[PDB]
């Protein structure tokens, strides 16, 4: 009977009755908590392992060690010593893998084709048994880590993240620098006689103890088979009894309370951070007092904190609630962005926060509020979307450290205890005497006197004046603040309509008129009471010029701003929407429980069509938008490279610069005039998909149409005005370079695009097979071996019905160097395709085949596939079977000549464009790089386009 290897098997693991997956919890003899998940339907299997150690446990003298260790586990073990055996195995079997390191966890996960779980899992287990920490792998990979940090140096959030740590108790582990870099991980340790390979060995051996591990494995196999699999590969992980680190002392003590920080940002942002130290509430998960308070302080409904701050013209957005620290400490935060007026009223903003908090004290804890949260969580759990395996295993592996086996599925959802004592206890901590205030603004530029070490952040620290504390300690009740009222959007009809006699497997065109094209599919898979309603509204006036594009955007920002109070309830109640301006007009998506969904939709369109602009709101949002256009200069070099390629290659695209300029001519009169004109003529293309009938779809569609007709007199657009934009057609054998400088970041970025031809069955699968075959090798060569940077990407580029192969890299090395390395790589690849076995070739076909045929696990993933088919106007709903049937037909030969025809350096149809984004500072061993021709340097985007042909558009299916 009893198994020596297993300490215990848990009881039934509580799950949604919608969840057909099966589950078994156990604890191994060496202390590993395990969840097993059997899903005989799944296409990919998955596992994850979470070690409850992370950077808070780094040696004080080697910042980043556990992060570095996390990179190093992938680079070879005693049992699979090839540096990239792991990632190549995954690649060849339709899988992928990643890992992350937080202060208390290191979390590793992969997925793979369901037939190769055991193979993937065996390779993975070795990470936790005997990594090699190869000496030469170590000297190389330390560059990946350094580059990971380089990218973050000039990110505002990362700097604030480390600044908070820099300003608490400096003796506290909380002040550690988790990322690491070349300095902390190589230079300084060399200076100090440290053998980093030994330190890695020591840290792994000391902390990667079985008692601190949780594993989750998801597979087609029975629960018994999964059980033996996990026993077999993980029993041997060794138990060293490591005590779980704990941090009962808060890193913010008294000398750190009532402090004000004035911080200089990189982007032009204006924000206020208010933070209070609290005890660790994790153990109170059955009541969740911190979520209760977040719900209330963070509310955006009538009566709310935000709603007053926004009326006063001081803030546009607010988040509040509990934020994690580590075992022993937490924080409660309330953060807002600041208008210009807001920037001068910080003191009053915070008084308001304290008045709102005093109101919660006065009314006392509210059982009815707790019930809503509880009901809404109960419903969210019952109808949760099936997760993608890799995310699911990863997530559960982390939380197995916090909840009994039997509750891991529900612990984060199901509320059980009403706890007015905890709610008051936490409320007693949200007091001016334990407050920390941080203001982020360019106005502090030059007025600061400190420098944070790791990021360079400039700031000032000041005692908040006792008198300001007092004024806050006496916050009176303010009549503008009320608790929210019953949330009427809470769904209660969950009936799944029976599948109609005329139901179809793909969307059907059930209406084709001048005004509107309606694609419809009743859900025949998921059976949750939800739906997705997507609409493209076409109008030439959304993008005719920069000015109109600015107006389209501001219109919609104003509209969302104006619906926000009303829409917030719907969103809490699992009904949300997304509304934005596109280069073709407008995009609207309403998703969630399909119960109350027509009410929200009808409200949106009605407000759209009878919209009245508040002037103060207009000015505020206009000023915010200007700044966001400027803030583009502080994006990363590789985002820049991607952006310019988009501008270069699309028929019509307005630059950020053009938009900025045109922005000053946006006046109130001008905007009021634009809206009716935009709405006067439209065509609507819709996908309605979910728990809805044909009749309800025609109904919803016509309702949108009628509302627009009634209030805005909309008429149909002419078929010819349904412009789609084309892609610049590159000449046989040309190479064009476009060069630019990133002014903020000290890295460069490049994007290289080898344009092939129009999309079609054969052309797509040539390009996809090739990308599949070169995919891990590019990563492995350009990053793991040559360490050109952290960001190294390769793959298909698809736009405007055209396609090709692209490379994106962000590096310290200059673009012209990057080019030559990619070119050298490309030659390695042709040779490699010649040299590979037939069977290696067929594995790649099979891996691409599995990737393409992976079934959607939830409604909105299936919707997205259809929506891609519609917005691209290819309407190829059965493309995966078609393209995969064709893929299976292909030979080495085909790919060799495809490459030779379209991709090789001397290819007769090479069509190459490169975007070079220079690092802030630049002024303008290895396989063999081919000689390259003189590029044509693009001097002006408009000229470049004028001088080239444009491709056709792709024909509909």
């Amino acid at each position: 009977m009893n198994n020596p290897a297993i300490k215990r098997i848990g009881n039934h693991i509580t799950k949604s009755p919608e969840d057909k997956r099966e589950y078994r919890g156990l604890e191994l003899a060496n202390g590993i908590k395990v969840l097993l998940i059997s899903d005989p339907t799944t296409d990919k299997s998955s596992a994850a392992l979470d070690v409850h150690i992370g950077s808070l446990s780094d040696p004080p003298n080697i910042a980043g060690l556990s992060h570095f260790l996390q990179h190093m586990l992938f680079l070879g073990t005693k049992k699979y010593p090839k540096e990239n055996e792991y990632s190549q195995f995954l690649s060849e079997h339709a899988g992928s893998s990643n890992a992350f390191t937080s202060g208390e966890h290191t979390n590793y996960y992969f997925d793979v084709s369901h037939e190769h779980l055991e193979g993937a899992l065996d390779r993975f287990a070795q990470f936790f048994l005997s990594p090699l920490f190869d000496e030469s792998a170590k000297d190389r990979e330390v560059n990946a880590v350094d580059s990971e940090h380089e990218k973050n140096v000039m990110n505002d959030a990362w700097r604030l993240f480390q600044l908070e740590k820099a300003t608490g108790n400096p003796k506290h582990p909380f002040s550690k620098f988790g990322t690491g870099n070349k300095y902390t991980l190589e230079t300084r340790p060399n200076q100090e006689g440290i053998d980093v390979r030994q330190e890695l060995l020591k840290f792994h051996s000391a902390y990667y103890s079985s008692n601190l591990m949780a594993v989750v494995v998801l597979g087609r196999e029975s629960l018994d088979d999964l059980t033996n699999l996990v026993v077999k590969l993980f029993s041997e992980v060794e138990n060293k009894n490591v005590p779980l680190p704990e941090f009962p002392e808060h890193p913010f003590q008294e000398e750190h309370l009532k402090q004000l920080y004035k911080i200089v940002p990189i982007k032009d942002i204006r924000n206020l951070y208010v933070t209070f130290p609290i005890p660790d509430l994790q153990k109170y998960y059955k009541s969740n007092p911190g979520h209760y308070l977040g719900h209330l302080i963070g509310h955006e409904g009538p009566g709310s904190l935000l709603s007053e701050l926004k009326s006063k013209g001081w803030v546009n957005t607010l988040v509040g609630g509990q934020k994690e620290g580590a075992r022993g400490f937490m924080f409660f935060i309330i953060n807002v962005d600041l208008t210009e007026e807001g920037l001068l009223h910080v003191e009053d903003i915070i008084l308001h926060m304290f008045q709102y908090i005093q109101k919660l004290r006065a009314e006392g804890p509210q059982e009815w509020v707790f019930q809503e949260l509880k009901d809404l969580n109960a419903v969210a759990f019952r109808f949760k979307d099936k997760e993608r395996p890799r995310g699911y295993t990863s997530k559960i592996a982390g939380i197995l450290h916090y909840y009994p086996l039997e509750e891991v599925l529900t612990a984060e959802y199901l509320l059980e205890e009403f706890r007015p004592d905890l709610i008051e206890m936490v409320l007693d901590k949200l007091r001016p005497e334990n407050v920390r205030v941080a203001i982020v603004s360019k106005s502090f530029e030059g007025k600061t006197d400190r420098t944070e070490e790791w990021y360079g952040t400039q700031y000032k620290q000041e005692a908040i004046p006792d008198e300001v504390i007092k004024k806050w300690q006496n916050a009176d009740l303010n009549g503008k603040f009320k608790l929210p009222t019953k949330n009427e959007f809470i769904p209660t009809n969950f009936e799944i309509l029976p599948l109609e006699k005329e139901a179809t497997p793909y969307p059907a065109l059930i209406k084709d008129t001048a005004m509107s094209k309606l694609w419809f599919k009743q859900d025949d898979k998921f059976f949750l009471p939800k739906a997705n309603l997507n609409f493209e509204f076409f109008s030439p006036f959304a993008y005719v010029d920069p000015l109109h594009s600015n107006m389209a955007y501001l219109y919609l920002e104003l509209l969302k701003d104006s619906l926000n109070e009303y829409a917030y309830a719907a969103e809490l109640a699992g009904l949300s929407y997304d509304l934005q301006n596109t280069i073709y007009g407008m995009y609207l998506s309403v998703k969630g429980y399909n119960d109350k969904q027509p009410i929200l939709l009808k409200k949106i369109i009605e407000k759209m069509a009878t919209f009245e602009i508040d002037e103060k709101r207009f000015e505020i949002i206009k000023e915010a938008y200007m700044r966001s256009l400027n803030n583009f200069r502080a994006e990363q070099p590789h985002q820049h490279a991607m952006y310019y390629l988009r501008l270069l290659m699309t028929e019509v695209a307005w630059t950020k610069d053009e938009l900025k300029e045109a922005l000053d001519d946006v006046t109130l009169p001008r905007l009021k005039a634009f809206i009716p004109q935009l709405l006067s003529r439209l065509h609507i293309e819709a996908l309605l998909h979910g728990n809805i009938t044909k009749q309800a779809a025609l109904g919803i569609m016509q309702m949108v149409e009628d509302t627009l007709i009634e209030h805005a007199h909309t008429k149909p657009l002419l078929p010819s005005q349904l412009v789609r934009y084309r892609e610049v057609q590159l000449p046989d054998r040309g190479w064009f370079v476009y060069q630019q400088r990133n002014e903020v970041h000290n890295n460069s970025g490049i994007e290289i695009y080898y344009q092939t031809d129009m999309q079609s069955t054969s052309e797509n699968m040539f390009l996809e097979l090739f990308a599949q075959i070169i995919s891990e090798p590019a990563f492995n060569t350009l990053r793991t071996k040559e360490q050109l940077g952290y960001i190294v990407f390769s793959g298909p580029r698809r736009a405007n019905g055209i396609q090709g192969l692209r490379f994106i890299i962000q590096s310290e090395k200059p673009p012209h160097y990057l080019e030559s390395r990619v070119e050298a790589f490309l030659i390695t690849m042709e040779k490699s395709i010649e040299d590979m076995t037939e069977e290696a070739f067929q594995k790649h076909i099979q891996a691409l085949a599995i990737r393409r045929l992976d079934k959607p696990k939830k409604l909105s993933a299936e919707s997205a596939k259809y929506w891609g088919e519609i917005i691209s106007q290819q309407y190829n709903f059965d493309r995966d079977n078609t393209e995969v049937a064709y893929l299976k037909t292909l030979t080495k030969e085909d790919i060799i000549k495809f490459y030779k025809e379209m991709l090789a350096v001397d290819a007769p149809r090479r069509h190459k464009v490169s975007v070079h984004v220079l690092a802030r500072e630049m002024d303008s061993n290895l396989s063999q790089a081919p000689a390259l021709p003189q590029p044509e340097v693009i001097q002006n985007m408009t000229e470049f386009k004028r001088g080239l042909p444009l491709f056709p558009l792709v024909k509909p299916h």
Binding site: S55, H67, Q70, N98, A99, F100, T101, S102, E148, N155, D156, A157, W158, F161, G178, T179, I269, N271, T317, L318, V319, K323, E324, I333, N335, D337, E635, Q636, Q639
Partner: peptide, 18 residues
């Protein structure tokens, strides 16, 4: 791979990048 706390317009900013 490290991460941080992604709150408000910071989560928005991160989602762009990713």
């Amino acid at each position: 791979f490290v991460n941080q706390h992604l709150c408000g317009s910071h989560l928005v900013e991160a989602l762009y990048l990713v």
